[PDB]
Amino acid sequence: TDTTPPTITVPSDIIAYRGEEFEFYFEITDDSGQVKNIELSTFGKPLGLNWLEYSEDNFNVPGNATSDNPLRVRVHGTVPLNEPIPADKNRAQFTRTIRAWDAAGNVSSNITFVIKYRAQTDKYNPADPTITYVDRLSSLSPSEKNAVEAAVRAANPQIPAAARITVSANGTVTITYPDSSTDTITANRVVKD
Amino acid sequence: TDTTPPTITVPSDIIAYRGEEFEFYFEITDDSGQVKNIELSTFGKPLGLNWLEYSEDNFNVPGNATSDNPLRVRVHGTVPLNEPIPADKNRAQFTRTIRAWDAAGNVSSNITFVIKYRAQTDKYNPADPTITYVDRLSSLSPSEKNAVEAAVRAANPQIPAAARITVSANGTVTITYPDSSTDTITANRVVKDLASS
Ligand SMILES: CC(=O)N[C@@H]1[C@@H](O[C@@H]2O[C@@H](C)[C@@H](O)[C@@H](O)[C@@H]2O)[C@H](O[C@@H]2O[C@H](CO)[C@H](O)[C@H](O[C@]3(C(=O)O)C[C@H](O)[C@@H](NC(C)=O)[C@H]([C@H](O)[C@H](O)CO)O3)[C@H]2O)[C@@H](CO)O[C@H]1O
Ligand SMILES: [Ca+2]
Ligand SMILES: [Ca+2]
Numbered sequence A: 001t002d003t004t005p006p007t008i009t010v011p012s013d014i015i016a017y018r019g020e021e022f023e024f025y026f027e028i029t030d031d032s033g034q035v036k037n038i039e040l041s042t043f044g045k046p047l048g049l050n051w052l053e054y055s056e057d058n059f060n061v062p063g064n065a066t067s068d069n070p071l072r073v074r075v076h077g078t079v080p081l082n083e084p085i086p087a088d089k090n091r092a093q094f095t096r097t098i099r100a101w102d103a104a105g106n107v108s109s110n111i112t113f114v115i116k117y118r119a120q121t122d123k124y125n126p127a128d129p130t131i132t133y134v135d136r137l138s139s140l141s142p143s144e145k146n147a148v149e150a151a152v153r154a155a156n157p158q159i160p161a162a163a164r165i166t167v168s169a170n171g172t173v174t175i176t177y178p179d180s181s182t183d184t185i186t187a188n189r190v191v192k193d
Numbered sequence B: 001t002d003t004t005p006p007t008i009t010v011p012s013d014i015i016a017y018r019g020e021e022f023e024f025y026f027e028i029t030d031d032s033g034q035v036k037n038i039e040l041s042t043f044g045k046p047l048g049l050n051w052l053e054y055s056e057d058n059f060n061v062p063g064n065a066t067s068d069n070p071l072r073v074r075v076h077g078t079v080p081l082n083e084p085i086p087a088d089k090n091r092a093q094f095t096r097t098i099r100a101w102d103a104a105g106n107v108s109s110n111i112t113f114v115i116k117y118r119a120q121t122d123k124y125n126p127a128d129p130t131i132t133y134v135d136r137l138s139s140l141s142p143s144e145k146n147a148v149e150a151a152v153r154a155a156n157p158q159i160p161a162a163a164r165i166t167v168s169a170n171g172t173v174t175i176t177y178p179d180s181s182t183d184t185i186t187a188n189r190v191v192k193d194l195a196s197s
């Protein structure tokens, strides 16, 4: 007789960035080798994350959840571009619960998982461009600004194309990400006489 | 004996744009058919334009300067990017003189030519971009600004690659040419509201 619920392994560090699709997996095992279904919730109440989705592939099939081959439930979604980020990082997150049951109806307790979310600049962090030589360190020309923007972009192919790169009069660089967060590169790493 | 100096024809409307290579030609003939050399000056003083250059190709060669085949002297250079243009832009010019020698020692009397220089925006006239549809007309997103800049650049391949295109919060476009002169495109010609369309 199966009297034991499934074991759920949740990822320890789920970190999502505003406007950027994330994915992670739950791994689930049962002694019977079969998991019937799962439920995501807010400690039993509605999940209330309309932008999160998960796959129900291979649910409630014999052998879908063994020690050697666990049930790997793919979860994905996108945190809204304008999700408010509290000054307190510790509350920039959603704490939710998952439970799972086997075909005998043995249900696990509600297990916690946490989706942390962050502004896009927390993901970036740009590399220094090859140095641009200019005539006046205090007043770059249009051509010199075009060259600086190109050198920043060349050295940073990993930044979103949709990010906008601006250059000030003295060669200070601002990168503005789609969610309106920013990075700066100071002139000393950008230009020289 | 040859006592007659060479005859020089000058172009009548020489216009150069700051930062952009220019060229024009003098045409010179002599009754002997041979011109030895020229002098560019400021009415007999030094030229004082170190960016003005010319070719001495075919100088002092028999037959280089006939009525049918004049000596054509290629003059070229680049007016410096930041050559100053005063409040009245008509003042932006240099009047200089040219004369020429034949092989018999006869030199022509100086005649004037005028190099007018102008801002790059006088040359360029930007076409409107294909319209960009935005969420908020008073506050464009970064991708909307990139899209606007791309649309403006795409609509104007003839504008200098070194010109810088910027976009404001409400979609107003500034094109800043390499010599720091500008053109503008008003928001109502660049962006429209997505929902209402
Ligand atoms: C007898 C003789 O040849 N004199 C020469 C000067 O000409 C005489 O003086 C001037 C002030 C005028 O009254 C002339 O009518 C007069 O004959 C000569 O001065 C230069 O004369 C030319 C006309 O021949 C012209 O006026 C010069 O002015 C400009 C120009 O067109 O070159 C006016 C421009 O706006 C200015 N450009 C800028 C950007 O400010 C230029 C510029 O200052 C110089 O060309 C750059 O060196 O001048 C006028 O200056 C004088 C010149 O050295 O030589 C005398 O032998
Ligand atoms: Ca079980
Ligand atoms: Ca399997």
Ligand SMILES: [Ca+2]
Binding pocket: A122, A123, A124
């Ligand atoms: Ca980080």
Ligand SMILES: [Ca+2]
Binding pocket: A120, A121, A122, A123, A124, A125, A126, A182, A183
């Ligand atoms: Ca960063």
Ligand SMILES: [Ca+2]
Binding pocket: A149, A165, B149, B165
């Ligand atoms: Ca740009």
Ligand SMILES: [Ca+2]
Binding pocket: B002, B003, B004, B005, B006, B030, B031, B032, B102, B104, B106
């Ligand atoms: Ca002669």
Ligand SMILES: [Ca+2]
Binding pocket: B120, B121, B122, B123, B124, B125, B126, B182, B183
């Ligand atoms: Ca113009």
